[PDB]
């Protein structure tokens, strides 16, 4: 029947590894996977203005590099013939100077190219054979018409997309959307060219992220005169930066359950006192806190005070206060 008493609360006086809450920046240094692709502001799908049949198709195919003016194929279009006569008649009989502009404008609405109309007025002869040329410099990513065939207005004779201001798009993890939004500069580096590495200062963060790989999409243009960076190449987008100053604590200091993150703080006496905190996000073994601690508080950097197997965190933390 001893009236002798004892402190029931858990105790640790044989030394504790402590750290202090510091306001500072979260430092980042990552390498995003990126790809090189065609400039989609340099697109061109060449279709005929009216059906006909292919007379001749120039030596060309998918994967070939064409420049503006490069002939694609020759076709016979007999849709504008009836009207071209109607015009040439107005010349043999000196029709009105506006009766002519009429037939000549219904002819351009008919689809007949502005240049093919001029070759009408100049030769004063009906036009049946036409040649379609590449509208822009680029790569032939499609070529659906060959010799011996016919042609319709839905058919595509050439899908030509360029690449001088070549495109590169990087996939940034959803996680740092809060950071990359206010980024300064990335450093582009492509494995295919160790000399084509350069700093990127202007880019555009797309409003949508990929689902398969939950990643933000960041697209940027690059000068590619020498045709060095070819579309289909891998590339890397480097990001070295630091966040706005936040409350920082060692990562091993945060005891997080599935729904309860918190840290055990050593007070002025040295007594263990668990506090609830709210974590913003971690980086490089140090997590930042949104709210819960003061700038300078002491906190033990160890989740190593509760047996992994099953130290029911709620219960185990409660054994430290009374």
């Amino acid at each position: 029947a001893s009236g002798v008493r004892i402190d029931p609360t858990q105790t640790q006086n044989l030394g504790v590894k402590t750290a202090t809450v510091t306001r500072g920046p979260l430092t980042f240094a990552q390498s995003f996977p990126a790809n090189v692709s065609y400039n989609e502001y340099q697109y061109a799908i060449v279709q005929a203005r009216a059906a006909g049949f292919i007379d001749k198709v120039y030596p060309l195919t998918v994967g070939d590099k064409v420049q503006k003016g490069t002939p694609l194929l020759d076709l016979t279009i007999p849709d504008w013939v009836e009207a071209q006569s109607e015009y040439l008649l107005l010349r043999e009989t000196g029709g009105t100077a506006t009766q002519t502009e009429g037939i000549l404008e219904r002819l351009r609405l008919a689809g007949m190219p502005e240049a093919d109309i001029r070759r009408l007025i100049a030769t004063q002869k009906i036009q049946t054979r036409f040649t379609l040329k590449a509208p822009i410099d680029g790569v032939i990513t499609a070529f659906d018409l060959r010799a011996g065939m016919n042609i319709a207005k839905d058919n595509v004779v050439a899908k030509i997309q360029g690449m001088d201001p070549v495109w590169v798009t990087a996939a940034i993890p959803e996680s740092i959307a809060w950071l990359v939004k206010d980024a300064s500069q990335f450093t582009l580096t492509v494995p295919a060219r160790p000399d084509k590495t350069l700093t990127i200062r202007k880019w555009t963060l797309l409003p949508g992220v990929d689902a398969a790989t939950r990643t933000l999409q960041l697209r940027l243009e690059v000068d590619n005169a020498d045709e060095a960076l070819k579309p289909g190449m891998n590339a890397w987008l480097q990001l070295n930066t630091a966040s706005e100053p936040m409350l920082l604590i060692p990562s091993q200091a945060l005891i997080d359950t599935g729904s309860e993150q918190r840290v055990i703080t050593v007070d002025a006496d040295g007594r263990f006192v668990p506090k609830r905190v709210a974590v913003f996000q971690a980086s490089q073994g140090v997590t930042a806190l949104r709210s819960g601690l003061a700038e300078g508080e002491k906190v033990v950097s160890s989740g190593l005070f509760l047996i992994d197997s099953e130290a029911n965190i709620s219960g185990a933390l409660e054994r430290m206060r009374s």
Binding site: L14, G15, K17, N35, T213, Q252, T257
Partner: protein, 1028 residues
Amino acid sequence: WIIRRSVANRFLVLMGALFLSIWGTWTIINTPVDALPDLSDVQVIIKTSYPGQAPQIVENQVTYPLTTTMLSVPGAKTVRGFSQFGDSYVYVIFEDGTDPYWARSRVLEYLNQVQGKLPAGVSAELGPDATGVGWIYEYALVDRSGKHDLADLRSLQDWFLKYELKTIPDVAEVASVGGVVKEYQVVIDPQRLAQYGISLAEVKSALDASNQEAGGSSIELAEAEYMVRASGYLQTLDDFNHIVLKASENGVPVYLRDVAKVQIGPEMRRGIAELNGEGEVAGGVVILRSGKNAREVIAAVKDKLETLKSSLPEGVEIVTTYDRSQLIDRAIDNLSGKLLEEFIVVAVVCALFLWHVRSALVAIISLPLGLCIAFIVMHFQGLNANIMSLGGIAIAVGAMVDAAIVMIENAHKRLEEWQHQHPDATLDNKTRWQVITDASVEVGPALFISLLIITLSFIPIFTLEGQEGRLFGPLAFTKTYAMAGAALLAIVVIPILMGYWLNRFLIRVYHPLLLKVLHWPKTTLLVAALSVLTVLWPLNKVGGEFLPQINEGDLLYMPSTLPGISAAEAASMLQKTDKLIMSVPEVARVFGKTGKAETATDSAPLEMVETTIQLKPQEQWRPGMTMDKIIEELDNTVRLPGLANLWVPPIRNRIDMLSTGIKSPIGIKVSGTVLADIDAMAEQIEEVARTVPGVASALAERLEGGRYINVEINREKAARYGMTVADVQLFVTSAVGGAMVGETVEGIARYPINLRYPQSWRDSPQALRQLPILTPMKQQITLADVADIKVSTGPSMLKTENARPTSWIYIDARDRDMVSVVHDLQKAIAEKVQLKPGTSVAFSGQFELLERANHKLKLMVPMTLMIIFVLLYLAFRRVGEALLIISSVPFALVGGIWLLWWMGFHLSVATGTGFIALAGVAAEFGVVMLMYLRHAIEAVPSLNNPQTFSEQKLDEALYHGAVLRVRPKAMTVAVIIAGLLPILWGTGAGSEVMSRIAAPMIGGMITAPLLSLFIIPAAYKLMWLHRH
């Protein structure tokens, strides 16, 4: 006989004892030393880890088929079994004398033919060379500066200290205890697994291929060999984070960091260590090889530490929690001091009876030589210097001089005649030569044979089978060694040494009651037998104990509790208890332990706790504080609800466990083939045991108090989502359980890696029912969709002994004597508790050890009486003669009992020994008493009796024999009682057992002579009349 060929060897026999003393002074200094004769039984354990699998399935498959393939092993005494959660302990104890290493190599081949009849993932790990008793040194690692933590300390212990220590010879194993093993915890977000369309199985698989190296052979450059090494070791947290789980054609991958957080945390804590109720710490126990020197190793350890005390990280100090070297010192630095008592006391006492300085010197040089011969023999033999080996060289010191003086005495008076017949002023070297030899011849036969008596009448002790035979065995050897040494030397040197070199006022108090004893001699014999019966009564009061409760400086505290407790709670319970123990001002350190330490020697559950209690020097305790009075405040101060606490000695317990397995002195085994029955029988006995007059604790560990949350998987429900029983279980083991999936390779070290959901998902049964599961078909379900989860009760620790289930009841009595409680229990149990069919009940512990010794002692008394019968018959040749001495020894036995009662001692194998040796000394007195009477008949006055009768002549031959003994007797019964007297009072480190074994003799050495001074004489004048 041989004394004739002695004097002739007057020369080189002297140097034969000179080189014997200088060589006996060398062997003595360099003799090994321990506290006791190693009393541990030879054992070989088999620890197995059958991960996950519940207790029952662990028993049936991995444990049971082992105890049955072990029981039938050559020389196996008994085989105990332990089936805990994910752990299998097979204990194989062998019979006495069975070569340890033989048994080991046998267990191995048996383990080869059963390595197949076992589960696929199981490997029977062979235990260490040592046992639990091999726990010598224990220490805890503490850092008050805070620079290091439980994780860093454990690592320090596992990968530094453990290695700097195991290389110390005679050390079998350095086990770590407590602390924290850093574990790479990959906590997976069940939700992100759905969002990223990655399954648990896929994770584990990916991880299992992101942590190894590869050899690309060699390549020849510049006629040189270039080795192609491929990296790939998992050594950074990022390496964990950037583990590839899934990659698109785009080249955009999905890393492990996308569905999990990789955090460093504690692993499953096996055991827990707490120091002075103010800190959880890591530490290590040093375990000593089976039969190697316990002290020799501790020293090599200390100095090994002082070498490391500099190379330790600034802040880490090694506090010591258990040092067996200290008990060794307090044990040997006591038996030595007590050999100085009897030495200087017997020499001085024989100096007050012998006026001559050179006469005493002869009986004095009888010890230094009797010493040497005892040592140089033990070295050959193979005996170290322990309390039970010196206790033999201490219990015997009294008769060593009894071999020298009884010879000298006969020469002191045999020289007083030549002076009274011859002149007094003419004597030479040859005339001083003859006198001493004649005297030595007349006492030659009697003594040598009676010392051959004391060492053969005592021989029967060797037959003590097992632990006690291991204890008093050395004492038996040592007593015989020094006796036979002081007997064979007394006929080779003693006579020559003595040749080179108020007795009134007792002879006046003796013969008045001697001549009175010749008043109808018959009657005096009867009143002597009557006194023997009055001296028989004291027996009833004295208690019974297997052995005196030896007191070591420290003591273990194990408090038993119900089976279910949780690790965290047991750790809490532990520290709480420590603070209480540290509250008492006699204890210096408290080293608490729950669970086990990293060694197959320790198979303790977290529910069970054993704390090592160091006590301040015995000279610092409060005023009238005793060891027993200390424990009273301990068992009264340290006590929490639902907890029964037992206090024992450290060493004693590790041996109490190796012989039986019970922690407490008193224990009851209830074996059965149906757990529900034995558990029913264990509780009833638990209730009756707590109403016994002198019990403090009574708790019988249950056999099925374990709690279960079982996930009864539904095959049909699971098939719905195309899941196999296996596929569902993956979540049970790794998602819900902390199942280990691998381990990092960090230099010489190694740390585990595991997958798991955040705790919140596995918080409770409810939680487990809503356990998120991403099916093969990318469907999102909960665990209860394919299974029912039910809580239930079942086996907690399937315990077996001889392949038969059993429960142990731990009883803690310490205010009464053992034999009293054990009997009062046998009465209480076998009357109020009606046994059920297949249920057996039998006591064990130290009581089972008393019934093994007492069956030996009872079949050891007749034979010691038959040998005494033949030694009296060989030296006297007379039947009635031998008979009379055989009937006289009982009087010596009887007198030794009163001293036990007075001293308040108990009946032990220690006391039992004292009486067998006492009887050997009684018959030693009985004969040297008769030779004076029988040779009083060889004289002429008594030669007149056979021719013609004389009532006067017969009384004078007896009166002369009485005077012929009062001098010898006064010396024999002096040096003995006075020499044994010092080692009688309790106080002393280890003296606890050396007094229990001394009182029987001393008490009997008073009434043996005092009585056999009148008995034997008044029976030789009553036996001489018959034939006439």
